[PDB]
């Protein structure tokens with residue numbers, strides 16, 4: 001299983017992309033930002049289920065989508081992109 005396949009199996013790519021910006025953060029850009037900053041993961045996945053705060057865009061992402069597992073996976077892919 002891959003988080004890139006799971007990232008496209010839901011609706012992340014609706015505005016994410018693994019290399020472009022639109023509504024949500026570019027996953028690859030997240031890699032080019034955080035890069036070696038793993039101190040959350042729980043509240044990072046909480047963003048995937050409660051909307052962001054506003055770093056690249058002032059429009060938080062649609063909160064709620066799953067539980068807190070299928071997201072936890074795509075939550076470490078962001079922090080762990082390359």
Ligand code: HEC
Pocket residue numbers: 007010011012013014015016023024025030044047048052053054055056057058059060061062065071074075078
């Ligand atoms: C558009 C309809 C989105 C969908 C569908 C998903 N995301 Fe998203 N995401 C979106 C926005 C508007 C934002 C915040 C705006 C800003 O630039 O800050 C985000 C951001 C994230 C983040 C955290 C980014 C951070 O600052 O490091 C993550 C980890 C994230 N989004 C996860 C994620 C996943 C896993 C999705 C599918 C399950 C997904 N997003 C969909 C917009 C949208």
